[PDB]
């Protein structure tokens, strides 16, 4: 052109994984909770339409959809797995979403609980003006 806006927003992906006192009856051993949020209390709700957590097939309604904060899933299980997360934007132009393969891993009974944090930076090249102010309100 030559001119370009490069808007960068920050995301936090993380999960807690605790061992239950007594297992559930269904037999599950652990309690975990997985989330997506902005760092340092950023309201990502401004540019995030919805967050989609894709659980394992073993779960009922494995597709969990949060379209209002907090964007998180709470469950109970026996094993860890790769959990595809999809974050949809208040976009109108590509990319409409971003996908992460989140490792929801669990620790053993004699080991301390999991409190994992993962950082992701998003870069939008030449976004629209309306989507920009949304991104910058975060």
């Amino acid at each position: 052109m030559a001119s370009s806006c490069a808007v960068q927003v920050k995301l936090e992906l993380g999960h807690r994984a605790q061992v239950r006192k007594k297992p559930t009856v269904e037999g599950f051993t652990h309690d975990w909770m997985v989330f997506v949020r902005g760092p340092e209390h950023s309201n990502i709700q401004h540019f995030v339409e919805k967050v989609v957590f894709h659980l394992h097939e073993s779960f009922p309604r494995p597709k969990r959809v949060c379209k209002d904060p907090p964007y998180k899933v709470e469950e109970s299980g026996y094993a860890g797995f790769i959990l595809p997360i999809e974050v949809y934007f208040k976009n109108k132009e590509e990319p409409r979403k971003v996908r992460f393969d989140y490792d929801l891993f669990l620790h053993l009974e004699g080991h301390p609980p999991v409190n994992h944090l993962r950082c992701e930076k998003l870069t939008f090249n030449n976004p629209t003006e309306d989507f920009r102010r949304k991104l910058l309100k975060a």
């Binding site: 394992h56 073993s58 094993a79 860890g80 797995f81 790769i82 891993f105 669990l106 620790h107 053993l108």
Partner: peptide, 7 residues
């Protein structure tokens, strides 16, 4: 080490 869901 830790249990996993098999795929």
């Amino acid at each position: 080490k830790a249990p996993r869901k098999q795929l």
